[PDB]
Amino acid sequence: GYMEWISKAEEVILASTFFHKKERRMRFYIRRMVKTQA
Amino acid sequence: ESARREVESQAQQQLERAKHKPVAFAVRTNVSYCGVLDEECPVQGSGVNFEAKDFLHIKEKYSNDWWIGRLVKEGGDIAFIPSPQRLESIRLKQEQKARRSGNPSSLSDIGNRRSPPPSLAKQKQKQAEHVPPYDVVPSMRPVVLVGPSLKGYEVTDMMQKALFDFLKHRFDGRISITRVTADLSLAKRSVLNNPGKRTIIERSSARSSIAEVQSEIERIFELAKSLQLVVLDADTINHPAQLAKTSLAPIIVFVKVSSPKVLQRLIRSRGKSQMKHLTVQMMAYDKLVQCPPESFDVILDENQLEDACEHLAEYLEVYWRATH
Amino acid sequence: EEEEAANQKLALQKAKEVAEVSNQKPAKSVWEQRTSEMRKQNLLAS
Amino acid sequence: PFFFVNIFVALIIITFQEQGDKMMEEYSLEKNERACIDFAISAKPLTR
Amino acid sequence: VWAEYDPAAWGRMPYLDMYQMLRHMSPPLGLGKKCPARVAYKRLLRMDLPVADDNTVHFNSTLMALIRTALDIKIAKGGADKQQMDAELRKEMMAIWPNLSQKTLDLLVTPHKSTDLTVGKIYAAMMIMEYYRQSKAKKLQAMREEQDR
């Protein structure tokens, strides 16, 4: 329970990794899709 | 008498017209006194039977002896609250019904030592502390969340960040979040009249950090008068009593892990960086745990985020409907 | 039973927070009933 | 044959329910105190 | 064992045979050969059953208490509790089976009669005094060497 709590908050903090800020977000985006029931 | 009835009707008309007006400010009490049983109130049957650790909301102006207030209880109607001078008078009235109050004891000593009451027997003395019956507090309670072990570290930071997000999202448009990097534990009211009033004095406290800490104390007050809920993102306070003697007296939200065993492995998940600092992160936990639960206002002792998320949610609308 | 007991305790704690404004499971089984008794008798003797 | 079948045998043993007998927690004693006292209810010395 | 100590199976056995019976049988049903005599007397008081003036102990009544002592079936702390557990236990057995005859039910567990001496009372004559009897020799001793000294 606590691991998922901090994990969601860590993604809240997130908002060539420096130029591709999206590159961190695709890692975040497909992280979302993996969790999805679909 | 027609005079008492006329001022009775005038008070009711004033109350009826003031039912829909903004609140002026709020007070904090420290004595269990009932304002419904006192016969000196302007209106009988509309008093306040409030105990200690209770909040009062004054809106309009009546006189120097009584005031119109409202309670933070849901459904609490408009009542009358004593003035701070009135309670000091009635406090002297509480202790005068006894057989003796000054130096002369009644141990079979009548007619020998009359002992007229000196300045010691009045409220002039006992001024070493002399705590006022009323304390100035924000009308709206700020909310401070105490982390599991220590703020400013990863485990606590995400442990706080998720709750901060939900406060932003669910209650958007009615809650404002303020973060203070400065300290807040040096909030004292009975130290001196004005320690370090100006920055050009070159005093020890003039150039110290007490200047901005005192300046941030009232910053909360304006946010409270705006009725929009506010929190305290203080990175220095990690224990409930550290900010309990001040005038903030805020809502303390306790998030805690059930056992120290899970917390240790919870820190392990962050990485080797927290492994350097782990040892003192456990001593800060049990010291906060050994504090009696009654000190905190709410406890989040559960592991599920959503179930904990609604736990703080349902406690907040009750605060909104309490004062509306 | 731990989850049920914790929920009842949490709901009780919820009352203090709001205090400012305020099928059938078969009865164990022959194995469970005997196993519980041996636990008591062994522990009672200790 | 060796492992799953003995789970079937074990699972039935552990989950077997009582033969009727109504509810059987209303009475406080239950347990084995019944069988000893039941014997004491109906007993006779072996006539020599 | 009861068949031999009462060879005719009268249903009544004088109590002098009973203590020897408890010695013969091992715990938890009987006292056992190596049981302490005073500890053995403790269980005898735990029986708390009326003593017949013919020295006899009922077969059904005696078997009941031995079970109760071993299994600790609501063994009372004493005093008013014993007055209540006998009222209680008889109701459980009545609750479990109403088919049992009331007279037979009172036969297994006698209705409380403080007039009738308990099984403990005859044995309490020995155990309490034997603790004093050894002390009685020491009591006369305690002054005796003091008198010589």
Side-chain angles (χ1 to χ4, degrees), chain B residues 192-252:
Chain B
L192 210 64
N193 281 24
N194 213 342
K197 47 174 67 176
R198 320 266 184 275
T199 65
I200 64 169
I201 316 172
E202 208 184 358
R203 207 179 177 182
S204 311
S205 280
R207 282 172 31 85
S208 86
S209 173
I210 193 166
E212 68 266 21
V213 179
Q214 182 61 254
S215 69
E216 292 295 352
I217 289 170
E218 64 273 352
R219 174 72 270 172
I220 298 168
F221 278 105
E222 290 90 7
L223 275 296
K225 308 192 251 204
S226 162
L227 187 153
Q228 311 300 308
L229 188 153
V230 72
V231 302
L232 300 184
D233 189 358
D235 294 331
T236 61
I237 297 89
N238 295 303
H239 165 96
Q242 185 176 1
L243 74 167
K245 296 178 289 184
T246 72
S247 97
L248 304 184
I251 295 298
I252 293 170

Coordinates of all heavy atoms in Angstrom, one line a residue, chain B residues 192-252:
Chain B
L192 N 8.5 39.7 24.7 CA 8.7 41.1 24.8 C 7.7 41.9 24.0 O 7.0 41.3 23.2 CB 10.2 41.5 24.4 CG 10.8 42.7 25.1 CD1 11.0 42.4 26.6 CD2 12.2 43.0 24.4
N193 N 7.6 43.2 24.2 CA 6.7 44.0 23.5 C 7.0 44.1 22.0 O 6.1 43.9 21.2 CB 6.7 45.5 24.1 CG 5.9 45.6 25.3 OD1 5.7 44.6 26.1 ND2 5.5 46.8 25.6
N194 N 8.3 44.2 21.6 CA 8.7 44.2 20.2 C 10.2 43.9 20.1 O 11.0 44.8 20.0 CB 8.4 45.6 19.7 CG 8.0 45.6 18.2 OD1 8.3 44.6 17.5 ND2 7.4 46.6 17.7
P195 N 10.5 42.6 20.1 CA 11.9 42.2 19.9 C 12.3 42.4 18.4 O 11.8 41.8 17.5 CB 11.9 40.7 20.3 CG 10.6 40.4 20.9 CD 9.6 41.4 20.3
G196 N 13.3 43.3 18.2 CA 13.8 43.5 16.9 C 12.7 44.2 15.9 O 12.4 43.6 14.9
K197 N 12.2 45.3 16.3 CA 11.2 46.0 15.5 C 11.7 46.5 14.2 O 11.0 46.5 13.2 CB 10.6 47.2 16.3 CG 11.6 48.1 17.0 CD 10.9 49.3 17.6 CE 10.1 48.9 18.8 NZ 9.5 50.1 19.5
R198 N 13.0 46.9 14.1 CA 13.6 47.5 12.9 C 14.8 46.7 12.6 O 15.5 46.2 13.4 CB 13.9 49.0 13.1 CG 12.8 49.7 13.8 CD 11.8 50.4 12.9 NE 10.8 51.2 13.6 CZ 9.7 50.8 14.2 NH1 9.4 49.5 14.1 NH2 8.9 51.6 14.8
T199 N 15.1 46.7 11.3 CA 16.3 46.0 10.8 C 17.6 46.8 10.9 O 18.7 46.3 10.6 CB 16.1 45.5 9.3 OG1 16.0 46.7 8.5 CG2 14.9 44.7 9.2
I200 N 17.5 48.1 11.2 CA 18.6 49.0 11.3 C 19.2 49.0 12.8 O 20.2 49.7 13.0 CB 18.3 50.4 10.8 CG1 17.2 51.0 11.7 CG2 17.8 50.3 9.4 CD1 17.0 52.5 11.5
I201 N 18.5 48.4 13.7 CA 19.0 48.4 15.1 C 20.4 47.6 15.2 O 21.1 47.9 16.2 CB 18.0 47.8 16.0 CG1 16.6 48.3 15.7 CG2 18.3 48.1 17.5 CD1 15.5 47.7 16.5
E202 N 20.6 46.7 14.3 CA 21.8 45.8 14.3 C 21.8 45.0 15.6 O 22.9 44.7 16.2 CB 23.1 46.6 14.2 CG 24.3 45.9 13.6 CD 25.6 46.7 13.5 OE1 25.5 47.8 13.9 OE2 26.6 46.1 13.1
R203 N 20.7 44.6 16.1 CA 20.6 43.8 17.3 C 20.8 42.3 17.0 O 20.8 41.9 15.8 CB 19.2 44.0 18.0 CG 19.2 43.8 19.5 CD 17.9 44.1 20.1 NE 17.8 43.8 21.5 CZ 16.8 43.9 22.3 NH1 15.6 44.3 21.8 NH2 16.9 43.6 23.6
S204 N 20.9 41.5 18.0 CA 21.1 40.1 17.9 C 19.9 39.5 17.2 O 20.0 38.7 16.3 CB 21.3 39.4 19.2 OG 22.4 40.1 19.9
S205 N 18.7 39.9 17.6 CA 17.4 39.4 17.0 C 17.0 40.2 15.8 O 16.2 39.7 14.9 CB 16.3 39.4 18.0 OG 16.3 38.3 18.8
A206 N 17.5 41.4 15.6 CA 17.2 42.2 14.5 C 17.7 41.6 13.2 O 17.0 41.6 12.1 CB 17.7 43.7 14.6
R207 N 18.9 41.1 13.2 CA 19.5 40.4 12.0 C 19.3 38.9 12.1 O 19.8 38.2 11.1 CB 21.0 40.8 12.0 CG 21.3 42.1 11.4 CD 22.8 42.5 11.5 NE 23.7 41.3 11.5 CZ 24.1 40.8 10.4 NH1 23.8 41.3 9.2 NH2 24.9 39.7 10.4
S208 N 18.6 38.4 13.1 CA 18.4 37.0 13.2 C 17.2 36.6 12.3 O 16.7 37.4 11.5 CB 18.2 36.6 14.6 OG 16.8 36.7 15.0
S209 N 16.7 35.3 12.4 CA 15.6 34.8 11.6 C 14.3 35.1 12.2 O 13.3 34.7 11.6 CB 15.8 33.3 11.3 OG 14.7 32.8 10.7
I210 N 14.2 35.6 13.5 CA 13.0 35.9 14.1 C 12.1 36.9 13.4 O 10.9 36.9 13.5 CB 13.2 36.3 15.6 CG1 11.9 36.2 16.4 CG2 13.8 37.7 15.7 CD1 12.1 36.3 17.9
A211 N 12.8 37.8 12.6 CA 12.0 38.8 11.9 C 11.0 38.2 10.9 O 9.9 38.6 10.9 CB 13.0 39.8 11.2
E212 N 11.5 37.3 10.0 CA 10.6 36.8 9.0 C 9.7 35.8 9.5 O 8.6 35.6 9.0 CB 11.5 36.2 7.8 CG 12.2 35.0 8.2 CD 13.7 35.3 8.6 OE1 13.9 36.4 9.0 OE2 14.5 34.3 8.6
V213 N 10.0 35.1 10.6 CA 9.1 34.1 11.2 C 7.9 34.8 11.8 O 6.8 34.4 11.6 CB 9.9 33.3 12.3 CG1 8.9 32.3 13.0 CG2 11.0 32.5 11.7
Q214 N 8.1 36.0 12.5 CA 7.0 36.8 13.0 C 6.2 37.4 11.9 O 5.0 37.5 12.0 CB 7.5 37.8 13.9 CG 6.5 38.7 14.6 CD 5.5 37.9 15.4 OE1 4.3 37.6 15.0 NE2 5.9 37.4 16.6
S215 N 6.9 37.8 10.8 CA 6.2 38.3 9.6 C 5.3 37.3 8.9 O 4.3 37.7 8.3 CB 7.1 39.0 8.6 OG 7.9 38.0 8.0
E216 N 5.7 36.0 9.0 CA 4.9 35.0 8.3 C 3.7 34.5 9.2 O 2.8 33.9 8.8 CB 5.7 33.8 8.0 CG 6.7 34.0 6.8 CD 6.1 34.3 5.5 OE1 4.8 34.2 5.4 OE2 6.8 34.7 4.6
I217 N 3.7 34.9 10.5 CA 2.7 34.5 11.4 C 1.3 35.1 11.0 O 0.3 34.4 10.9 CB 3.0 34.9 12.9 CG1 4.2 34.0 13.4 CG2 1.8 34.8 13.8 CD1 4.8 34.5 14.7
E218 N 1.3 36.4 10.8 CA 0.1 37.0 10.4 C -0.3 36.7 8.9 O -1.5 36.9 8.6 CB 0.1 38.5 10.6 CG 1.1 39.3 9.8 CD 2.5 39.4 10.4 OE1 2.6 39.0 11.6 OE2 3.4 39.9 9.8
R219 N 0.7 36.3 8.1 CA 0.4 36.0 6.7 C -0.7 34.9 6.6 O -1.5 34.9 5.7 CB 1.7 35.5 6.0 CG 1.5 34.9 4.6 CD 1.2 36.0 3.6 NE -0.2 36.2 3.5 CZ -0.8 37.2 2.7 NH1 0.0 38.1 2.1 NH2 -2.1 37.3 2.7
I220 N -0.7 34.0 7.6 CA -1.8 33.0 7.6 C -3.1 33.6 7.9 O -4.2 33.2 7.4 CB -1.4 31.9 8.7 CG1 -0.1 31.2 8.3 CG2 -2.5 30.9 8.8 CD1 0.5 30.3 9.4
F221 N -3.1 34.7 8.8 CA -4.4 35.2 9.2 C -5.2 35.8 8.1 O -6.5 35.5 8.0 CB -4.1 36.4 10.2 CG -3.9 35.8 11.6 CD1 -2.6 35.8 12.2 CD2 -4.9 35.4 12.4 CE1 -2.4 35.3 13.4 CE2 -4.7 34.9 13.7 CZ -3.4 34.9 14.2
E222 N -4.6 36.5 7.1 CA -5.4 37.0 6.0 C -6.0 35.9 5.1 O -7.1 36.0 4.7 CB -4.6 37.9 5.1 CG -4.2 39.3 5.8 CD -2.9 39.2 6.5 OE1 -2.2 38.2 6.4 OE2 -2.5 40.2 7.2
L223 N -5.2 34.8 5.0 CA -5.8 33.7 4.2 C -7.0 33.1 5.0 O -7.9 32.6 4.4 CB -4.7 32.6 4.0 CG -3.8 32.7 2.8 CD1 -4.5 32.6 1.5 CD2 -3.0 34.0 2.8
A224 N -6.9 33.1 6.3 CA -8.0 32.5 7.1 C -9.3 33.4 7.0 O -10.4 32.9 7.0 CB -7.6 32.3 8.5
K225 N -9.1 34.7 7.0 CA -10.2 35.7 6.9 C -10.9 35.6 5.5 O -12.0 36.0 5.4 CB -9.7 37.1 7.2 CG -9.0 37.3 8.5 CD -8.9 38.7 8.8 CE -7.4 39.2 8.7 NZ -7.1 40.4 9.5
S226 N -10.2 35.0 4.5 CA -10.7 34.9 3.2 C -11.5 33.6 3.0 O -12.0 33.4 1.9 CB -9.6 34.9 2.1 OG -10.0 34.4 0.9
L227 N -11.6 32.8 4.0 CA -12.5 31.6 4.1 C -12.0 30.5 3.2 O -12.5 29.4 3.2 CB -14.0 32.0 3.8 CG -15.1 31.1 3.9 CD1 -16.4 31.8 4.2 CD2 -15.4 30.3 2.6
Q228 N -11.0 30.8 2.3 CA -10.5 29.8 1.4 C -9.5 29.0 2.2 O -8.5 29.5 2.8 CB -9.8 30.4 0.2 CG -10.7 31.4 -0.5 CD -12.0 30.8 -1.0 OE1 -12.1 29.8 -1.7 NE2 -13.2 31.5 -0.6
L229 N -9.6 27.6 2.2 CA -8.9 26.8 3.2 C -7.4 26.8 2.8 O -7.0 26.8 1.6 CB -9.4 25.4 3.1 CG -8.9 24.3 4.1 CD1 -10.0 23.3 4.4 CD2 -7.6 23.7 3.7
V230 N -6.5 26.8 3.8 CA -5.1 26.9 3.6 C -4.4 25.8 4.4 O -5.0 25.3 5.4 CB -4.6 28.3 4.0 CG1 -4.6 28.5 5.5 CG2 -3.2 28.5 3.5
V231 N -3.2 25.4 4.0 CA -2.4 24.4 4.7 C -1.1 25.1 5.0 O -0.7 26.1 4.5 CB -2.2 23.1 3.9 CG1 -3.6 22.5 3.6 CG2 -1.4 23.4 2.7
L232 N -0.3 24.3 5.8 CA 1.1 24.8 6.2 C 2.1 23.7 5.7 O 2.1 22.6 6.3 CB 1.2 25.0 7.7 CG 0.3 26.1 8.3 CD1 0.5 26.3 9.7 CD2 0.4 27.3 7.5
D233 N 2.8 24.1 4.7 CA 3.9 23.2 4.1 C 5.2 23.5 4.8 O 6.2 23.7 4.2 CB 3.9 23.3 2.6 CG 4.8 22.3 2.0 OD1 5.4 21.5 2.7 OD2 5.0 22.3 0.7
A234 N 5.2 23.5 6.1 CA 6.4 23.8 6.9 C 7.3 22.6 6.9 O 7.0 21.5 7.3 CB 6.0 24.2 8.3
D235 N 8.6 22.9 6.5 CA 9.6 21.8 6.4 C 10.4 21.6 7.6 O 11.4 20.8 7.6 CB 10.5 22.1 5.2 CG 9.8 22.1 3.8 OD1 8.8 21.3 3.7 OD2 10.2 22.8 2.9
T236 N 10.1 22.4 8.7 CA 10.9 22.3 9.9 C 10.2 21.7 11.1 O 10.8 21.0 11.9 CB 11.3 23.7 10.3 OG1 10.1 24.5 10.6 CG2 12.1 24.4 9.2
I237 N 8.9 21.8 11.1 CA 8.1 21.2 12.2 C 7.9 19.7 11.9 O 7.4 19.3 10.8 CB 6.8 21.9 12.5 CG1 7.0 23.4 12.9 CG2 5.9 21.2 13.5 CD1 7.1 24.3 11.7
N238 N 8.2 18.8 12.9 CA 7.9 17.4 12.8 C 7.3 16.8 14.1 O 7.4 15.6 14.3 CB 9.2 16.7 12.5 CG 9.8 17.0 11.1 OD1 9.1 16.9 10.1 ND2 11.0 17.5 11.0
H239 N 6.7 17.6 14.9 CA 6.1 17.1 16.2 C 5.0 18.0 16.6 O 5.1 19.2 16.5 CB 7.2 17.0 17.3 CG 6.6 16.8 18.7 ND1 6.4 15.6 19.2 CD2 6.2 17.7 19.6 CE1 5.9 15.7 20.4 NE2 5.7 17.0 20.7
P240 N 3.9 17.4 17.1 CA 2.7 18.2 17.3 C 2.8 19.3 18.3 O 2.3 20.4 18.1 CB 1.6 17.2 17.7 CG 2.4 16.0 18.2 CD 3.6 16.0 17.3
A241 N 3.5 19.1 19.4 CA 3.6 20.1 20.5 C 4.6 21.2 20.1 O 4.6 22.3 20.7 CB 4.1 19.5 21.8
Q242 N 5.4 21.1 19.0 CA 6.3 22.1 18.6 C 5.6 23.3 18.1 O 6.1 24.5 18.2 CB 7.2 21.6 17.5 CG 8.3 22.5 17.1 CD 9.2 21.9 16.0 OE1 9.1 20.8 15.6 NE2 10.2 22.7 15.6
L243 N 4.3 23.2 17.6 CA 3.5 24.3 17.1 C 2.2 24.4 17.8 O 1.2 24.9 17.3 CB 3.4 24.2 15.6 CG 2.4 23.2 15.0 CD1 2.2 23.4 13.5 CD2 2.9 21.7 15.2
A244 N 2.1 23.9 19.0 CA 0.9 23.8 19.8 C 0.7 25.0 20.8 O -0.4 25.4 21.1 CB 0.8 22.5 20.6
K245 N 1.8 25.5 21.3 CA 1.8 26.7 22.2 C 1.7 28.0 21.5 O 1.5 29.0 22.1 CB 3.0 26.7 23.1 CG 3.1 25.5 24.0 CD 4.4 25.5 24.8 CE 5.6 25.3 24.0 NZ 6.9 25.2 24.8
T246 N 1.8 28.0 20.2 CA 1.8 29.3 19.4 C 0.3 29.7 19.2 O -0.6 29.0 19.6 CB 2.5 29.1 18.1 OG1 1.8 28.3 17.2 CG2 3.9 28.5 18.3
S247 N 0.1 30.8 18.5 CA -1.3 31.3 18.2 C -1.9 30.6 17.0 O -3.0 30.9 16.7 CB -1.2 32.8 18.1 OG -1.2 33.2 16.7
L248 N -1.1 29.8 16.3 CA -1.7 29.2 15.1 C -2.7 28.1 15.5 O -3.8 28.0 15.0 CB -0.6 28.6 14.3 CG 0.5 29.6 13.8 CD1 1.5 28.9 12.9 CD2 -0.1 30.7 13.1
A249 N -2.3 27.2 16.5 CA -3.1 26.1 16.9 C -3.8 25.4 15.8 O -5.0 25.2 15.8 CB -4.1 26.6 17.9
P250 N -3.0 24.9 14.8 CA -3.6 24.4 13.5 C -4.1 23.0 13.6 O -3.8 22.3 14.6 CB -2.4 24.6 12.5 CG -1.2 24.6 13.4 CD -1.6 24.6 14.9
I251 N -4.8 22.6 12.6 CA -5.2 21.2 12.5 C -4.0 20.3 12.1 O -3.3 20.6 11.1 CB -6.3 21.0 11.4 CG1 -7.6 21.8 11.9 CG2 -6.6 19.6 11.2 CD1 -8.2 21.2 13.2
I252 N -3.7 19.4 12.9 CA -2.5 18.5 12.7 C -3.0 17.2 12.2 O -3.8 16.5 12.8 CB -1.7 18.3 14.0 CG1 -1.1 19.6 14.5 CG2 -0.6 17.2 13.8 CD1 -0.5 19.6 15.8

